[PDB]
Amino acid sequence: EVQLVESGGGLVQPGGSLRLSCAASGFNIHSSSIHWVRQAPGKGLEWVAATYSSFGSITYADSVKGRFTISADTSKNTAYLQMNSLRAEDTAVYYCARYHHPFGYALDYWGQGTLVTVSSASTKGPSVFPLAPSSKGGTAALGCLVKDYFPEPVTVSWNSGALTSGVHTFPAVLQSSGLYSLSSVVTVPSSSLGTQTYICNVNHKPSNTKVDKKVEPK
Amino acid sequence: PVCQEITVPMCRGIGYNLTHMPNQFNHDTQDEAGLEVHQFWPLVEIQCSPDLRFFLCSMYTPICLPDYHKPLPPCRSVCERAKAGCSPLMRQYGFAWPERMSCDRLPVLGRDAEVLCMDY
Amino acid sequence: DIQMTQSPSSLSASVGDRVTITCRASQSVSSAVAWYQQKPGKAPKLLIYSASSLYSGVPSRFSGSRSGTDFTLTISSLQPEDFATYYCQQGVYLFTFGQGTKVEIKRTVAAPSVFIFPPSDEQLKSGTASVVCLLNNFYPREAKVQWKVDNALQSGNSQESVTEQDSKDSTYSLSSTLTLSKADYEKHKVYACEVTHQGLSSPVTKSFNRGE
Ligand SMILES: *[C@@H]1O[C@H](CO)[C@@H](O)[C@H](O)[C@H]1NC(C)=O
């Protein structure tokens, strides 16, 4: 109902440009205040920029002033963060957020974040391989290995979201090749291995890759 | 001009109870008017000017009176008091007194009976 | 430029414990200090604004207070779902953040269940073999996973990943992935991972025989 949804994240070359969108619902951005906050991988939150409709103002953190620009399309109720001259240190998850209503001094609604990777390396879609429940305790494990992709992220679900209990999708690791790899596993009753279909749904939007891999016992 | 009970929190209990929409900023609902005027709430709380809450509300939730249909803006003096007490703090935060709220656009108290203003 | 110094940088505490997090302004500031909770992969959630006002929907166990330039977030009775990183925020209209406090839940020791996965036939065709060892739902996080190939201890060809703490049972899970070329893979028979953990009285080994 009242929410913020971001889009536009992805891979960009150093010195390149990228525009992020922050789409609002349930209030008009053009009578609100929208802020941008980013988080480099494994780091803390850094405030980036903000508009205030009351003051008619736009303010940028010194770390981005001169390279980042805010605008909005009121007919689409969407705010934009235009990024230019991007640096490796700009790699981060970018959030938009609303100035706290009614009392201020904070940010109440936040978007889900979108990852911007500033790198010269090339996009690569992953291969998806089964992690098969073997034969040789009541519980069995199976999974999918999602190997050799760039950039982050990939998302994994099981049985189109019908299977959530017992799922672990591991954080990706960077291999010495410069490509990411991850696994997603799930534990299930061993008596179910012959009677239930298990499918991992893998998505890598940077390469527009989508894979539904059935994982069969061996 | 249909009157609406004021629902914007910071404009409750300012001297009048009814407003009309749209306001001069083209906000067509008090939810929109309130979303914007509440950005000023920190300035009301720090009390840079005792006139600020009334001044802002007199624009964002303008007074609505049962039969009287003519506009009733705040007076130039009210705006000038609010700008005097609060524009230095606004500049310290990195902003400026909003251009939409320049006081010379407001009627002067008692200078004309064709354009009435609100002060007292 | 106001600096917010947060302490501690991380802490561990049991369910039911009282937890206190402190953020110190570098100079006199107003009560314009907020607290956020951030869980893995999610946006921060507002807990406290204006040093001590609770935000909508925030559970009663959270509270904030201030003394001078020292602002404190208190969780009166830690819950398993309170695993998160907590951030202070300073400012009225433009914001700066503290560097964050990671809060981990202490629980009883839980030994991992161990599983080993051989490389798939699909992968082997391409000339690479990945062998995966899974440690599931254990605590504490510290664990030792060793690979042995025909009983030869492996070094330098594996990588581990650990999940963030489970918000329900406060455990961790861990993967170790051994990468070999197909040619290296087909020179050996016994593939084993050996797991050591505080919860296991002796090391657990899971293993398979290539093509068996
Ligand atoms: C405005 O409404 C309040 C009730 O909240 C009432 O006490 C007050 O008399 C009203 N003022 C008017 C009608 O001028």
Coordinates of C-alpha atoms and ligand atoms in Angstrom, one line a residue:
Chain A
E1 CA 0.0 0.0 0.0
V2 CA 2.5 2.7 1.2
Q3 CA 5.8 1.5 -0.1
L4 CA 8.9 2.2 -2.1
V5 CA 10.3 -0.1 -4.9
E6 CA 13.7 0.4 -6.4
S7 CA 15.0 -0.7 -9.8
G8 CA 17.9 0.0 -12.1
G9 CA 20.8 -1.7 -10.3
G10 CA 23.4 -3.7 -12.1
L11 CA 26.9 -3.7 -13.6
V12 CA 28.5 -0.5 -14.8
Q13 CA 32.1 0.2 -16.0
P14 CA 34.3 2.6 -14.0
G15 CA 33.6 6.1 -15.2
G16 CA 30.3 5.0 -16.5
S17 CA 26.7 6.1 -15.7
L18 CA 23.6 4.5 -14.3
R19 CA 20.1 5.8 -13.3
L20 CA 18.3 4.3 -10.3
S21 CA 14.5 4.5 -9.9
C22 CA 12.5 4.7 -6.6
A23 CA 8.8 4.1 -7.3
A24 CA 6.4 5.2 -4.6
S25 CA 2.9 3.9 -3.8
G26 CA 0.3 5.2 -1.3
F27 CA 1.7 8.8 -1.1
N28 CA 2.9 11.4 -3.6
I29 CA 6.7 11.8 -3.7
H30 CA 6.3 15.4 -4.9
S31 CA 4.9 16.4 -1.5
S32 CA 7.4 14.3 0.5
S33 CA 11.1 14.0 1.2
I34 CA 13.0 11.2 -0.4
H35 CA 16.5 10.2 0.7
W36 CA 19.2 7.9 -0.7
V37 CA 21.3 5.7 1.5
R38 CA 23.9 3.2 0.3
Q39 CA 25.8 0.3 1.9
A40 CA 29.0 -1.1 0.4
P41 CA 29.3 -4.9 0.7
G42 CA 30.0 -5.8 4.3
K43 CA 30.1 -2.1 5.4
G44 CA 27.7 0.3 7.2
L45 CA 25.1 2.7 6.0
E46 CA 26.2 6.0 4.3
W47 CA 23.7 8.8 3.7
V48 CA 24.0 9.9 0.0
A49 CA 21.4 12.6 -0.9
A50 CA 17.9 13.9 -0.2
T51 CA 15.2 16.2 -1.6
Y52 CA 12.7 18.2 0.5
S53 CA 9.5 19.3 -1.3
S54 CA 8.9 21.8 1.6
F55 CA 12.2 23.6 1.1
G56 CA 12.3 22.9 -2.6
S57 CA 15.8 21.6 -1.9
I58 CA 18.3 19.0 -3.1
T59 CA 21.3 18.1 -1.0
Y60 CA 24.2 15.7 -1.8
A61 CA 26.8 14.2 0.5
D62 CA 30.3 15.5 -0.3
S63 CA 31.3 12.0 -1.4
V64 CA 29.0 12.2 -4.4
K65 CA 28.4 15.9 -5.0
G66 CA 29.1 16.7 -8.6
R67 CA 28.6 13.2 -9.9
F68 CA 25.1 12.3 -8.7
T69 CA 21.9 14.1 -9.6
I70 CA 18.3 13.7 -8.4
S71 CA 15.2 14.3 -10.5
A72 CA 11.6 12.9 -10.5
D73 CA 8.7 12.0 -12.8
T74 CA 5.7 13.0 -10.8
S75 CA 3.3 11.4 -13.3
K76 CA 4.9 8.0 -12.5
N77 CA 5.4 8.9 -8.8
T78 CA 9.0 7.9 -9.2
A79 CA 12.2 9.6 -8.0
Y80 CA 15.5 9.0 -9.8
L81 CA 19.2 8.9 -8.8
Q82 CA 21.3 9.6 -11.8
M83 CA 24.9 8.5 -11.2
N84 CA 27.8 9.6 -13.4
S85 CA 31.6 9.1 -13.3
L86 CA 31.1 6.0 -11.2
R87 CA 34.0 4.8 -9.1
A88 CA 34.8 1.4 -7.6
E89 CA 34.0 2.9 -4.2
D90 CA 30.4 3.6 -5.4
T91 CA 29.8 -0.2 -5.5
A92 CA 27.0 -0.7 -3.0
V93 CA 23.4 -1.5 -2.3
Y94 CA 21.4 1.7 -2.8
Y95 CA 18.2 2.4 -0.8
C96 CA 15.7 5.1 -1.2
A97 CA 13.7 6.1 1.9
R98 CA 11.1 8.5 3.0
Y99 CA 11.6 11.2 5.6
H100 CA 9.7 10.1 8.7
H101 CA 6.1 11.3 8.8
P102 CA 4.7 12.9 10.9
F103 CA 7.5 13.5 13.4
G104 CA 10.6 13.7 11.3
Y105 CA 14.2 13.2 12.4
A106 CA 14.4 9.8 10.7
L107 CA 13.5 7.7 7.7
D108 CA 10.4 5.6 8.1
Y109 CA 9.6 3.7 4.8
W110 CA 12.5 2.1 2.9
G111 CA 12.8 0.4 -0.5
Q112 CA 14.3 -3.0 -0.8
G113 CA 17.7 -1.9 -2.1
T114 CA 19.3 -2.4 -5.5
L115 CA 22.9 -3.5 -6.0
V116 CA 25.2 -1.4 -8.2
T117 CA 28.5 -3.0 -9.1
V118 CA 31.2 -0.8 -10.7
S119 CA 33.6 -3.1 -12.4
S120 CA 35.4 -3.6 -15.8
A121 CA 34.8 -7.3 -15.8
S122 CA 32.2 -8.8 -18.1
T123 CA 28.8 -10.2 -17.3
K124 CA 28.6 -14.0 -17.2
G125 CA 25.5 -16.1 -16.5
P126 CA 25.8 -19.1 -14.2
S127 CA 25.7 -22.8 -14.8
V128 CA 23.3 -24.7 -12.4
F129 CA 24.3 -28.2 -11.3
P130 CA 22.4 -30.6 -9.0
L131 CA 23.6 -31.6 -5.6
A132 CA 22.0 -35.0 -5.5
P133 CA 20.8 -36.8 -2.4
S134 CA 23.0 -39.9 -2.2
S135 CA 22.2 -43.4 -1.1
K136 CA 25.4 -44.7 0.6
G137 CA 18.6 -40.9 9.3
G138 CA 15.1 -39.8 8.2
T139 CA 16.5 -36.5 6.8
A140 CA 18.1 -36.1 3.4
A141 CA 19.8 -33.0 1.9
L142 CA 19.8 -31.9 -1.8
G143 CA 20.6 -28.7 -3.5
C144 CA 21.8 -26.7 -6.5
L145 CA 25.3 -25.4 -7.2
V146 CA 25.1 -22.1 -9.1
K147 CA 28.6 -21.7 -10.5
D148 CA 30.7 -19.1 -12.3
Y149 CA 28.6 -15.9 -12.6
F150 CA 29.2 -12.1 -12.5
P151 CA 28.1 -9.7 -11.2
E152 CA 26.0 -10.4 -8.1
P153 CA 23.2 -11.2 -7.4
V154 CA 21.5 -14.5 -8.0
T155 CA 18.3 -15.5 -6.3
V156 CA 17.2 -19.1 -5.6
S157 CA 13.8 -20.4 -4.6
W158 CA 12.6 -24.0 -4.3
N159 CA 9.3 -25.4 -5.9
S160 CA 8.4 -21.9 -7.1
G161 CA 8.3 -20.7 -3.4
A162 CA 6.2 -23.6 -2.1
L163 CA 9.3 -25.0 -0.3
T164 CA 10.8 -22.5 2.2
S165 CA 11.4 -24.6 5.4
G166 CA 14.8 -26.1 5.7
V167 CA 16.3 -24.0 2.8
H168 CA 19.7 -22.5 3.1
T169 CA 21.0 -20.4 0.2
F170 CA 24.6 -19.6 1.0
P171 CA 26.3 -16.2 0.5
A172 CA 28.3 -16.3 -2.7
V173 CA 32.0 -16.7 -2.7
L174 CA 34.4 -15.0 -5.1
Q175 CA 36.6 -17.6 -6.7
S176 CA 40.2 -17.0 -7.8
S177 CA 38.8 -16.8 -11.3
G178 CA 37.0 -13.6 -10.4
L179 CA 33.6 -15.3 -10.8
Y180 CA 31.0 -15.9 -8.1
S181 CA 29.7 -19.3 -7.1
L182 CA 27.0 -20.3 -4.5
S183 CA 24.9 -23.3 -3.4
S184 CA 21.4 -23.5 -2.2
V185 CA 20.5 -26.6 -0.2
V186 CA 17.3 -27.9 1.5
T187 CA 16.8 -30.8 4.0
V188 CA 13.7 -32.9 3.4
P189 CA 12.4 -36.2 4.7
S190 CA 14.4 -39.1 3.2
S191 CA 11.1 -40.9 2.7
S192 CA 10.0 -38.1 0.3
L193 CA 12.9 -38.5 -2.2
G194 CA 10.9 -41.0 -4.3
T195 CA 7.6 -39.2 -4.1
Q196 CA 8.2 -35.4 -4.2
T197 CA 9.6 -33.3 -7.1
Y198 CA 12.2 -30.8 -6.0
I199 CA 13.1 -27.9 -8.3
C200 CA 15.5 -25.0 -7.6
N201 CA 14.5 -21.8 -9.4
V202 CA 17.6 -19.8 -10.2
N203 CA 17.5 -16.2 -11.5
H204 CA 20.4 -14.0 -12.6
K205 CA 18.8 -10.8 -13.9
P206 CA 22.2 -9.3 -14.9
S207 CA 22.5 -12.0 -17.6
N208 CA 18.7 -12.4 -18.0
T209 CA 19.3 -16.1 -17.0
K210 CA 16.4 -18.2 -15.6
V211 CA 16.8 -21.9 -14.7
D212 CA 14.4 -24.4 -13.1
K213 CA 16.6 -27.4 -12.3
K214 CA 14.9 -30.6 -11.1
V215 CA 17.2 -32.3 -8.5
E216 CA 16.8 -36.1 -8.7
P217 CA 18.3 -38.8 -6.4
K218 CA 21.1 -40.7 -8.1
Chain B
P1 CA -16.0 26.1 -1.1
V2 CA -16.8 22.9 1.0
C3 CA -15.2 23.0 4.4
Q4 CA -13.2 20.0 5.8
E5 CA -12.4 19.5 9.4
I6 CA -8.6 19.9 9.7
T7 CA -6.9 16.5 9.9
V8 CA -3.2 17.5 9.6
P9 CA -1.8 16.9 13.1
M10 CA 0.4 19.9 13.4
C11 CA -2.4 22.2 12.3
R12 CA -4.9 21.0 14.9
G13 CA -5.7 23.7 17.5
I14 CA -4.3 26.8 15.9
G15 CA -7.4 29.0 16.2
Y16 CA -9.6 27.7 13.4
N17 CA -10.9 24.2 12.8
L18 CA -12.0 24.0 9.2
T19 CA -10.0 24.2 5.9
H20 CA -10.7 23.9 2.2
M21 CA -8.8 22.0 -0.5
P22 CA -7.0 22.4 -2.8
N23 CA -4.5 24.7 -1.1
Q24 CA -2.3 27.2 -2.9
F25 CA 0.4 24.5 -3.5
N26 CA -2.2 22.5 -5.5
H27 CA -2.4 19.8 -2.8
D28 CA -5.9 18.4 -3.3
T29 CA -6.0 16.3 0.0
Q30 CA -4.9 17.1 3.6
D31 CA -2.8 13.9 3.5
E32 CA -0.7 15.5 0.8
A33 CA -0.7 18.9 2.5
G34 CA 0.2 17.3 5.8
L35 CA 3.0 15.2 4.2
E36 CA 4.6 18.4 3.1
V37 CA 4.0 20.8 6.0
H38 CA 5.2 18.1 8.4
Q39 CA 8.7 18.4 6.9
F40 CA 8.8 21.7 8.9
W41 CA 7.9 20.0 12.2
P42 CA 11.5 20.1 13.6
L43 CA 11.5 23.9 13.1
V44 CA 8.2 24.2 15.0
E45 CA 9.5 22.0 17.8
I46 CA 12.7 24.1 18.3
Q47 CA 10.6 27.3 18.4
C48 CA 12.6 29.5 16.1
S49 CA 9.5 31.6 15.8
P50 CA 6.2 31.5 17.7
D51 CA 4.5 32.5 14.4
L52 CA 5.7 29.6 12.4
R53 CA 3.0 26.9 13.0
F54 CA 0.2 29.4 12.4
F55 CA 1.8 30.8 9.3
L56 CA 2.5 27.5 7.7
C57 CA -1.0 26.2 8.5
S58 CA -2.6 29.3 7.2
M59 CA -1.1 28.4 3.8
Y60 CA -1.2 24.5 3.9
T61 CA -4.6 24.2 5.5
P62 CA -6.1 27.6 4.8
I63 CA -9.1 28.7 6.8
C64 CA -12.5 27.8 5.6
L65 CA -15.5 29.7 6.9
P66 CA -19.2 28.6 6.4
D67 CA -20.5 31.3 4.1
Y68 CA -17.5 33.6 3.5
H69 CA -16.1 32.6 0.1
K70 CA -13.2 35.0 -0.3
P71 CA -9.5 34.1 0.4
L72 CA -8.0 34.7 3.8
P73 CA -4.2 34.6 3.6
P74 CA -1.8 35.2 6.5
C75 CA -0.6 38.8 6.8
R76 CA 2.7 40.0 5.5
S77 CA 3.7 40.8 9.1
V78 CA 3.1 37.2 10.2
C79 CA 5.2 35.9 7.4
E80 CA 7.9 38.5 8.1
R81 CA 8.1 37.5 11.8
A82 CA 8.3 33.8 10.8
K83 CA 11.0 34.4 8.2
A84 CA 13.0 36.6 10.6
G85 CA 13.1 34.0 13.4
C86 CA 13.4 30.9 11.3
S87 CA 15.3 31.6 8.0
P88 CA 18.7 31.7 9.8
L89 CA 18.2 28.2 11.1
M90 CA 17.0 27.0 7.7
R91 CA 20.1 28.4 6.1
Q92 CA 22.2 26.6 8.8
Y93 CA 20.6 23.3 7.8
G94 CA 21.5 24.0 4.2
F95 CA 18.2 25.4 2.9
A96 CA 16.7 28.8 2.3
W97 CA 13.4 30.4 3.1
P98 CA 11.1 28.8 0.5
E99 CA 10.5 31.0 -2.5
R100 CA 6.8 30.1 -2.6
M101 CA 6.5 31.8 0.8
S102 CA 7.9 35.2 0.0
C103 CA 6.2 37.7 2.3
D104 CA 5.8 40.5 -0.2
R105 CA 3.1 38.3 -1.9
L106 CA 0.9 38.8 1.2
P107 CA -1.6 41.5 2.0
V108 CA -0.7 44.2 4.6
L109 CA -2.8 44.4 7.8
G110 CA -5.5 47.0 7.3
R111 CA -4.1 48.6 4.1
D112 CA -7.1 47.4 2.1
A113 CA -10.6 46.2 2.8
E114 CA -10.8 44.6 -0.6
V115 CA -8.0 42.1 0.3
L116 CA -8.3 41.0 4.0
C117 CA -5.5 39.2 5.7
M118 CA -5.1 37.2 8.9
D119 CA -2.8 38.2 11.7
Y120 CA -4.0 38.6 15.4
Chain C
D1 CA 30.9 16.9 10.3
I2 CA 29.5 15.1 13.3
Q3 CA 30.9 11.6 14.0
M4 CA 28.8 9.0 15.8
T5 CA 31.0 6.3 17.5
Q6 CA 29.1 3.1 18.2
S7 CA 30.1 0.5 20.7
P8 CA 30.5 -2.4 21.0
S9 CA 31.2 -3.3 17.4
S10 CA 29.6 -6.7 18.0
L11 CA 28.3 -8.7 20.9
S12 CA 26.8 -12.1 21.7
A13 CA 24.0 -12.7 24.2
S14 CA 21.5 -15.3 25.3
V15 CA 17.7 -15.3 24.7
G16 CA 16.2 -13.3 27.6
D17 CA 19.3 -11.3 28.2
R18 CA 19.4 -7.5 28.5
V19 CA 21.5 -5.9 25.7
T20 CA 22.7 -2.3 25.7
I21 CA 24.2 -0.5 22.6
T22 CA 25.9 2.9 22.9
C23 CA 26.4 5.6 20.3
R24 CA 28.5 8.7 21.3
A25 CA 28.3 12.0 19.4
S26 CA 31.6 13.7 18.7
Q27 CA 30.2 17.0 19.9
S28 CA 27.1 18.4 21.6
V29 CA 24.1 17.5 19.6
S30 CA 20.3 17.7 20.1
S31 CA 18.3 14.6 20.9
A32 CA 18.0 14.0 17.1
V33 CA 19.4 10.5 17.2
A34 CA 17.6 7.5 15.7
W35 CA 18.2 3.7 15.9
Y36 CA 17.7 1.2 13.1
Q37 CA 17.7 -2.6 13.0
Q38 CA 19.0 -4.3 9.8
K39 CA 18.6 -8.0 9.1
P40 CA 20.5 -9.9 6.4
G41 CA 19.5 -8.9 2.8
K42 CA 16.9 -6.4 4.1
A43 CA 16.6 -2.7 4.4
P44 CA 17.0 -1.1 7.9
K45 CA 13.9 -0.8 10.0
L46 CA 13.3 2.2 12.2
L47 CA 13.1 1.5 15.9
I48 CA 13.6 4.7 17.8
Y49 CA 13.6 8.4 16.8
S50 CA 14.4 11.6 18.8
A51 CA 16.6 9.5 21.1
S52 CA 13.8 7.8 23.0
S53 CA 10.5 7.8 21.0
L54 CA 9.4 4.3 19.9
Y55 CA 8.4 3.9 16.2
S56 CA 5.0 2.4 15.2
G57 CA 4.9 -1.4 15.6
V58 CA 8.2 -1.7 17.4
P59 CA 8.1 -4.3 20.2
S60 CA 8.1 -3.2 23.8
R61 CA 11.6 -4.7 24.6
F62 CA 13.3 -1.9 22.6
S63 CA 13.9 1.4 24.2
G64 CA 16.3 4.4 23.9
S65 CA 17.7 7.0 26.3
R66 CA 20.4 9.6 26.4
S67 CA 22.9 11.1 28.9
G68 CA 25.0 14.0 27.6
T69 CA 26.5 13.0 24.3
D70 CA 25.8 9.3 25.0
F71 CA 22.8 7.6 23.4
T72 CA 21.8 4.0 24.3
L73 CA 19.6 1.5 22.7
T74 CA 18.4 -1.2 25.1
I75 CA 16.8 -4.5 24.3
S76 CA 15.3 -5.6 27.6
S77 CA 14.9 -9.3 26.8
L78 CA 16.7 -10.5 23.7
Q79 CA 14.8 -12.8 21.3
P80 CA 16.2 -15.1 18.6
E81 CA 14.7 -12.9 15.9
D82 CA 16.7 -9.9 17.2
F83 CA 19.8 -11.1 15.5
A84 CA 20.7 -8.1 13.3
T85 CA 23.1 -5.2 13.0
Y86 CA 21.9 -2.1 14.8
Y87 CA 22.8 1.4 13.6
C88 CA 22.5 4.8 15.3
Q89 CA 21.7 7.8 13.1
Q90 CA 22.4 11.4 13.9
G91 CA 20.7 14.4 12.4
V92 CA 17.5 16.5 11.8
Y93 CA 17.4 16.8 8.0
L94 CA 20.7 15.5 6.8
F95 CA 22.0 12.2 8.4
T96 CA 25.1 10.5 9.5
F97 CA 25.3 6.9 10.8
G98 CA 27.2 5.1 13.4
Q99 CA 29.3 2.1 12.2
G100 CA 26.9 -0.5 13.5
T101 CA 26.7 -3.2 16.2
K102 CA 26.2 -6.8 15.2
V103 CA 24.2 -8.7 17.7
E104 CA 24.5 -12.5 17.7
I105 CA 22.4 -14.9 19.9
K106 CA 24.1 -17.3 22.3
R107 CA 22.3 -20.7 22.4
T108 CA 23.0 -24.3 23.5
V109 CA 25.6 -26.3 21.5
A110 CA 24.2 -28.0 18.5
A111 CA 26.2 -30.5 16.5
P112 CA 26.0 -30.3 12.7
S113 CA 24.4 -32.9 10.5
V114 CA 27.0 -33.6 7.7
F115 CA 26.3 -34.3 4.0
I116 CA 28.6 -34.8 1.1
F117 CA 27.7 -34.2 -2.6
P118 CA 29.7 -35.6 -5.5
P119 CA 30.1 -33.6 -8.7
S120 CA 27.3 -33.9 -11.2
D121 CA 27.8 -35.6 -14.5
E122 CA 26.6 -32.4 -16.2
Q123 CA 29.5 -30.5 -14.6
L124 CA 32.1 -33.1 -15.2
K125 CA 31.5 -33.0 -19.0
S126 CA 32.7 -29.3 -18.9
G127 CA 36.0 -30.4 -17.3
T128 CA 35.5 -29.2 -13.7
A129 CA 34.5 -31.2 -10.6
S130 CA 33.1 -29.5 -7.6
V131 CA 32.7 -31.5 -4.4
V132 CA 30.4 -30.0 -1.7
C133 CA 30.3 -30.7 2.0
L134 CA 27.4 -29.4 4.0
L135 CA 27.3 -28.8 7.8
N136 CA 23.7 -28.1 8.8
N137 CA 22.1 -26.2 11.7
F138 CA 25.0 -26.0 14.2
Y139 CA 26.2 -23.8 17.1
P140 CA 28.6 -22.2 17.9
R141 CA 29.8 -21.0 14.5
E142 CA 33.4 -22.3 14.8
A143 CA 33.9 -25.5 12.9
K144 CA 36.8 -27.3 11.1
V145 CA 36.1 -29.0 7.8
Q146 CA 39.0 -31.0 6.1
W147 CA 39.0 -32.6 2.7
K148 CA 40.8 -35.9 2.1
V149 CA 41.3 -37.5 -1.3
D150 CA 42.4 -41.2 -1.1
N151 CA 43.2 -40.2 2.5
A152 CA 45.5 -37.3 1.4
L153 CA 44.8 -34.1 3.3
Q154 CA 43.9 -31.3 0.9
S155 CA 45.1 -27.7 1.0
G156 CA 44.4 -24.6 -1.1
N157 CA 41.6 -25.9 -3.3
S158 CA 38.5 -25.3 -1.2
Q159 CA 36.3 -22.4 -0.2
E160 CA 33.8 -22.1 2.6
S161 CA 30.5 -20.1 3.0
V162 CA 28.5 -19.7 6.2
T163 CA 24.9 -18.6 6.5
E164 CA 23.9 -15.7 8.7
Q165 CA 22.5 -16.8 12.0
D166 CA 19.0 -18.4 11.7
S167 CA 16.4 -16.0 13.1
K168 CA 14.3 -19.0 14.5
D169 CA 16.8 -21.6 16.0
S170 CA 19.9 -19.3 16.1
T171 CA 22.1 -21.9 14.3
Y172 CA 24.5 -21.6 11.4
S173 CA 25.0 -23.7 8.3
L174 CA 28.2 -24.0 6.4
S175 CA 29.4 -25.3 3.0
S176 CA 32.9 -26.3 1.9
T177 CA 33.4 -26.7 -1.8
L178 CA 36.5 -28.5 -3.2
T179 CA 37.3 -27.7 -6.9
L180 CA 39.4 -30.0 -9.1
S181 CA 39.8 -30.5 -12.8
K182 CA 38.0 -33.5 -14.3
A183 CA 41.4 -35.0 -14.9
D184 CA 42.5 -34.6 -11.3
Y185 CA 39.1 -35.8 -10.2
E186 CA 39.4 -39.1 -12.1
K187 CA 42.8 -40.0 -10.7
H188 CA 41.3 -40.9 -7.3
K189 CA 38.5 -42.9 -5.6
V190 CA 37.7 -41.9 -2.0
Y191 CA 36.4 -38.4 -1.5
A192 CA 35.8 -37.5 2.1
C193 CA 35.2 -34.4 4.3
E194 CA 35.9 -34.6 8.0
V195 CA 34.1 -32.3 10.4
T196 CA 35.2 -31.2 13.9
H197 CA 32.8 -29.3 16.1
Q198 CA 32.4 -28.6 19.8
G199 CA 29.1 -30.6 19.6
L200 CA 30.8 -33.8 18.2
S201 CA 32.6 -36.1 20.6
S202 CA 34.9 -37.2 17.7
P203 CA 35.3 -36.1 14.1
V204 CA 32.5 -37.1 11.7
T205 CA 33.5 -38.1 8.1
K206 CA 31.2 -38.4 5.1
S207 CA 32.6 -39.9 1.9
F208 CA 31.8 -41.4 -1.5
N209 CA 33.7 -43.5 -4.0
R210 CA 34.0 -42.0 -7.5
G211 CA 31.4 -43.5 -9.8
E212 CA 29.8 -45.6 -7.0
Ligands
LIG1 C1 -12.4 23.2 17.5 O1 -12.7 21.9 17.9 C2 -12.4 21.6 19.3 C3 -12.6 20.1 19.5 O2 -11.4 19.4 19.2 C4 -13.3 22.5 20.1 O3 -12.9 22.3 21.5 C5 -13.2 24.0 19.7 O4 -14.2 24.7 20.4 C6 -13.3 24.2 18.2 N1 -13.1 25.5 17.9 C7 -13.9 26.3 17.1 C8 -15.1 25.6 16.6 O5 -13.6 27.4 16.8

